[PDB]
Amino acid sequence: TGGIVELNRQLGRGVNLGNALEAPWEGAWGVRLEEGFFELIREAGFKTIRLPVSWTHHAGRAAPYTIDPAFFSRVDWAVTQATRRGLNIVVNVHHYDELNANPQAEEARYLSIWRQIAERYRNQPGSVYFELLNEPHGRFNDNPQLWNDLLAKALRVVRESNPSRAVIVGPVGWNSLWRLSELRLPDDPNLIVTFHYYDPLEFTHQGAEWLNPVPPTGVVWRENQGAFAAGWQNWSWGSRVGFVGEALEITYQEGWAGFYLHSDAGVEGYDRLAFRTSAPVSLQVSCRRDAPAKAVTTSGGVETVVNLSECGNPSRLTDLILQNNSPNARAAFRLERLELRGPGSPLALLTHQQNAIAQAMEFAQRWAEQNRRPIFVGQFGAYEKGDLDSRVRWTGAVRSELEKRNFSWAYWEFAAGFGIYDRTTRQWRTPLLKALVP
């Protein structure tokens, strides 16, 4: 055949049947599967269903951890409805609180679950894909090597009965592309690498009721909006930090407040930090956590440059802090420029939203090309609390960059809160669907 590259290409455009079998039981989170869903998805031009399945509530707590035959039968049914409509289907292990909380303790039960799944579907055609663990987090975030070791063990279990089926594997940080460099894979030739994409979280998860506190809404997304460079998260504290038009406004609202960008990936090869403020600002500059900061005072409209060796001297720059050098709050100012400099080409930390999407997909593609692995972006979507035009813009921009890079993908999700199909009106949410299938 064509190998794993062709299997990934055949994944093509896909959609998640979410809020369904990955809840503790089907319908617990609002979506019960129906046969007509598969037909609608096929008719809308998707080639693939991703089927999130949380198995732990359906398996014995004691060895041999047998999965409920009725639940297994429901997964059988979904596999059948996909296949009979000419769709691919990705079967995963999705939510698994116990495993993320204690990988070592829960390992045997998880591996038994995978052995049951792999043996049960061993004779399915190449249109059926396995996905070892959705979004590893918890202890896996603390020690990524736990996930590297576990995924290798689970892969060996799967390969005992499925010697060549495509197996989808992602990094920790909830399948964050920024943690790809911590992922380590065995030399198995039939692996597809996955990441999920929700940047910027302030927009895609605005109004998320599952968080405490609930993030604010009314966040708009536009290609030309200001943004931080891809992968630099706003970890600021004690401050109002935000783009207003072309300007990054910083209000230090308390003593020692900090403007703080953090990257899970980090960067190498820079030796200086350059920035410019609209007013003279007295700062503590730090580019390495728990390292000594350097005191600097800028002047309005005039660039200041600081050698990284003098404010923490990191080898891999992951944390960048401009801290209010004062026990009191400070009036708002504009950060007009912020860029890293080195022997090579500078890194502008301030950019625009569209370019941030492109930068993220370029980073993933560089990883995938270096490691010679195909890429499937198994989840991306913007929550319904955002205004629809912004969601359409974001969704189409993301899908476009994905396909420009020949990433296969699966939108989150078919129905419910990220949904593209309105089950009440029994109609597609047309502009969002068109963002995915133009």
Author numbering: 15 to 452
The publication says:
Initial attempts to crystallize wild-type MtGlu5 failed. Instead, the inactive mutant E393Q (dubbed iMtGlu5) was first crystallized in a suitable form for structure determination. The initial map showed some density outside the CD regions, and amino-acid residues corresponding to the CBM were manually placed, followed by computational refinement and new map calculations. Notably, the inserted CBM is not a fixed attachment, as its orientation varies with respect to the CD in the monoclinic and tetragonal crystals of iMtGlu5 and MtGlu5. The CBMs of the two iMtGlu5 molecules differ by a rigid-body rotation of 22.5°, and they differ from that of wild-type MtGlu5 by rotations of 25.3° and 10.8°. While large-scale conformational changes are often observed in enzymes upon substrate binding, the moderate flexibility of CBM in MtGlu5 probably allows switching between different orientations of polysaccharide chains. Because the CMC titrant and its molar concentration of binding sites are unknown, the n value was modified to 1 together with adjusting the concentration of the titrant. The data show that iMtGlu5 has a strong affinity for the recognition of long single polysaccharide chains with K d = 5.71 × 10−6.
Here, by solving the crystal structure, it is shown that MtGlu5 from Meiothermus taiwanensis WR-220, a GH5-family endo-β-1,4-glucanase (EC 3.2.1.4), has a bipartite architecture consisting of a Cel5A-like catalytic domain with a (β/α)8 TIM-barrel fold and an inserted CBM29-like noncatalytic domain with a β-jelly-roll fold. Unlike other known cellulases with CBMs at the termini, this inserted CBM in the newly identified MtGlu5 acts in synergy with the CD, as demonstrated by ITC experiments.
